Write a protein that binds this ligand. Sequence first.
Ligand SMILES: CCCCCCCCCCCCCCCC(=O)O
Ligand SMILES: CCCCCCCCCCCCCCCC(=O)O
Lengths: 45, 45, 45, 45, 45
Amino acid sequence: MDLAPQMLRELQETNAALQDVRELLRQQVKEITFLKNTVMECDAC
Amino acid sequence: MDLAPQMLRELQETNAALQDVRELLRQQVKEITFLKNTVMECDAC
Amino acid sequence: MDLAPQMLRELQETNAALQDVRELLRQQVKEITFLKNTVMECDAC
Amino acid sequence: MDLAPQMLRELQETNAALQDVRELLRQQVKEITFLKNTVMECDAC
Amino acid sequence: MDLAPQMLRELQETNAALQDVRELLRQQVKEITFLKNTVMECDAC
Ligand SMILES: CCCCCCCCCCCCCCCC(=O)O
Ligand SMILES: CCCCCCCCCCCCCCCC(=O)O
């Protein structure tokens, strides 16, 4: 029973998931950077 | 011993793990986003 | 020589590393959710 | 060979995606360490 | 046989990148835990 078809589908699913992770990660970096900047300008510090 | 069956199984396992990593990141990004807003509206700042 | 066994080995190691990432992430989210709860009750804000 | 070409293409794309994820995390750690030291060096605290 | 050589190369590249990610997350969780302990002790809160 040839399993290559199914294996290809798993690999494509991997890239689909990874692309989601990358997009979530780059937005997360923006949120952390905003957080950093807000703290710096925090007079209390 | 055609290892396609075992290979396929590892791939399927990789995706299951990645699905979980993605869901975890989504909730994490949400928590961080909430934190950003809070600090921005911080009186002491 | 046949490179299939080597390939399966790389896949097994990929999943091992992926499983570690999941545990770390799982823990990270908790530390963050904790940080959030603390900031929510910061008397400075 | 059959689907081999497409499989190899998915693997390369996964790699490129990983490269970016890695680059983003290295920046994210830098931002977290800064934020860390900033709060650690906050008069208010 | 087959594009096994090129495919294996991409997987080794994948695992090497992944191992770096685990280590980056390793350090990152530590930093977060440190920030958490720091905010928990902030006298401003
Ligand atoms: C029908 C017998 C032919 C000999 C066996 C051919 C071996 C390849 C079977 C397809 C495996 C999945 C796609 C190739 C990718 C890989 O080498 O891992
Ligand atoms: C052959 C398939 C390989 C699968 C590739 C594994 C991808 C793992 C990606 C891990 C991303 C880590 C998430 C970042 C966490 C954080 O933001 O703190």
